[PDB]
Curated annotation (Swiss-Prot), chains A, B:
Keywords: Calcium, Endoplasmic reticulum, Glycoprotein, Membrane, Metal-binding, Mitochondrion, Muscle protein, Phosphoprotein, Sarcoplasmic reticulum, Signal. This is Calsequestrin-1. It is a peripheral membrane protein. The keyword Plastid does not apply. It comes from Oryctolagus cuniculus. Calsequestrin is a high-capacity, moderate affinity, calcium-binding protein and thus acts as an internal calcium store in muscle. Calcium ions are bound by clusters of acidic residues at the protein surface, often at the interface between subunits. Can bind around 80 Ca(2+) ions. Regulates the release of lumenal Ca(2+) via the calcium release channel RYR1; this plays an important role in triggering muscle contraction. Negatively regulates store-operated Ca(2+) entry (SOCE) activity. N-glycosylated.
Length: 353, 353
């Protein structure tokens, strides 16, 4: 009578060597397929160990998601070059995710936790329908990502169908919501076929012009407004966000949401964002250190800061050179006006404008 | 001008094969040392893959914590049996952590995130001193773990020294706090040399009897009150918590703190705990599904429940057989009285009392 153990990695291989002979069979077996497009084995042990690690991370995810019908596979850039061509794999050592007719080029953290969460999100339907109070409140409480909501007659509306096609284009990174309920639309202030776009951390939405909107009109609008003035660094999308610099730099704010000072600082950052939302030259990345435990020592060393306290700085993406605002924790945090004044001082001696 | 990359696992081996010839040198090099006491390689590939995974997890942690002077090593139960004896390694395939004169037998999740967070906590001083407002408020806001606070004259008080020795015994699992400030003591209602013990999720503390307290008096008291009526499953300690069953079963509640319904349910659970805090036969484990993304599919399948909603049930630790309370999400959540009545109904047909 020992007592059952928690689940454990079982050491059984599940990741598929995807090749010319089996790739069609593989796609037929799984509704969602995650493929690592990678390079051939190098001579050096370091590279071999790096690959060994990545493959095992995939093995763990494959074990967790086996019952859900998610498949995992490897496409070698040498041995499987022709497979890569048919599927459109190009980015070296990168994960591509396939669902029905959509291909996703994953640009997030290579960890089992993050990958499993992402793939569970991929499995969900692309549009969330709002019918009840719980669901409406859930929609209203989303602030840390862009979100869209439309009001349509019902699921058979050509305009709802266009909205759903657009949703699939950005799935699962940007949540699309719909309602068919005139009462809900009333609370959201939506006319029929109207789509409201909510920038991350903004209270007021922008309505997509020229309704009813075609799928292309929605997709164009979202692409144009893809970068929020304030955006959160999230494991699922961290590389895409960081690679999207503003002329070689990022304004970076560290704030632990769960901490009193972190929360207050975030509220200040949201104010700064709101007051500058129309300036296309401004993007601030909010990093909550609690989301990236393995990077905190690196950040503290590299930036010479204490991540137990809120920070704001400017980072050069070429060499990670940076400058950080002095804040005395014995005083109140700087107001939005003080933050903006500091950013102006620092950025006045920089690249442009 | 590509742009610097985020840090990555470099594939360089850092985990030490600890043996009879080097073990004394290893302990001298590091202030904190984490040793995996493990079995010799089996013949089957499955076992070999399991070990391969564990070792690489240690490699990742070793890379992250290299600058902090944390060392990682392997002690083979066959090749290194004599080393295991000198150090007191006994638990098969288990991690032991060494700091100065303390040995910790890790009983938490074997993941790099969790291990690094734990070891960063190990590195910190065992007693947190409360001098200012921020620190006092931080102390007051802790609810999900047991905490102790004492008021002493200064660091040279023999009674403070006893408190610190006791703190080292439970470090870093149970936070010990001290103040030397009479004003702070006044707000906390502490007399000189008085130590207040706060059970997790309880508002009212219990004062350790018979002050001033010896180190042994404090340690005895903490051990006697080690199990809180409501306790949170945490990655760092999950196996210790789960293995501490109440006569073969656990009452388990799933609640996502960040969700409206989850938060409300947690508030109800806290009420249930408070109303039954004196009953030594009652322990409820609160699991926030958000803390264990890799186990959610397993739990949903095994227990036949939807973890997007609050749940409460009784689980048999032998075979994971279970029963879960029906709650209709279109109605309000059950009151504390309803929850208690349900638990009584289910547990009346069980093992004892
Ligand atoms: Ca292949
Ligand atoms: Ca409107
Ligand atoms: Ca139109
Ligand atoms: Ca904006
Ligand atoms: Ca060894
Ligand atoms: Ca008191
Ligand atoms: Ca005494
Ligand atoms: Ca109690
Ligand atoms: Na999403
Ligand atoms: Na702790």
């Amino acid at each position: 009578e020992e007592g059952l153990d928690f689940p454990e990695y079982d050491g059984v291989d599940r990741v598929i060597n995807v090749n010319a002979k089996n790739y069609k069979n593989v796609f037929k077996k799984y509704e969602v397929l995650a493929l690592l497009y990678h390079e051939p084995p190098e001579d050096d042990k370091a590279s071999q160990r790096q690959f060994e690690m990545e493959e095992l991370i995939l093995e763990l995810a494959a074990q967790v998601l086996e019952d859900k019908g998610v498949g995992f596979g490897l496409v070698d850039s040498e041995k499987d070059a022709a497979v890569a061509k048919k599927l459109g794999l190009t980015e070296e050592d990168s994960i591509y995710v396939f669902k029905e007719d959509e291909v996703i080029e994953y640009d997030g953290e290579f960890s089992a936790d993050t990958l499993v969460e992402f793939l569970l999100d991929v499995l969900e339907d692309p549009v969330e329908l709002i019918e009840g109070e719980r669901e409406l409140q859930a929609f209203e409480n989303i602030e840390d990502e862009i979100k869209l909501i439309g009001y349509f007659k019902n699921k058979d509306s050509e305009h709802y169908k266009a909205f759903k096609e657009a949703a699939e284009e950005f799935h699962p990174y940007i949540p699309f919501f719909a309602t068919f309920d005139s009462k809900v639309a009333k609370k959201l202030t939506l006319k029929l076929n109207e789509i409201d776009f909510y920038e991350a951390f903004m209270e007021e939405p922008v309505t997509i012009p020229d309704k009813p909107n075609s799928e292309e009109e929605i997709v164009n609008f979202v692409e144009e407004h893809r970068r929020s003035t304030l955006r959160k660094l999230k494991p699922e999308s961290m590389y895409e966000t960081w690679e999207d610099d503003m002329d070689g730099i990022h304004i970076v704010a560290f704030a632990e949401e769960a901490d009193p000072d972190g929360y207050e600082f975030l509220e200040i950052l949201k104010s700064v964002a709101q007051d500058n939302t129309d300036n296309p030259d401004l993007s601030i990345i909010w990093i909550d250190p609690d989301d990236f435990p393995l990077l905190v020592p690196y950040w503290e060393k590299t930036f010479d800061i204490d991540l137990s306290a809120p920070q704001i700085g400017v980072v050069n993406v070429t060499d990670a050179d940076s400058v950080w605002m002095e804040m005395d924790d014995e005083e109140d945090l700087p107001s939005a006006e003080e933050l903006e004044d500091w950013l102006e001082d620092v950025l006045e001696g920089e690249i442009n404008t």
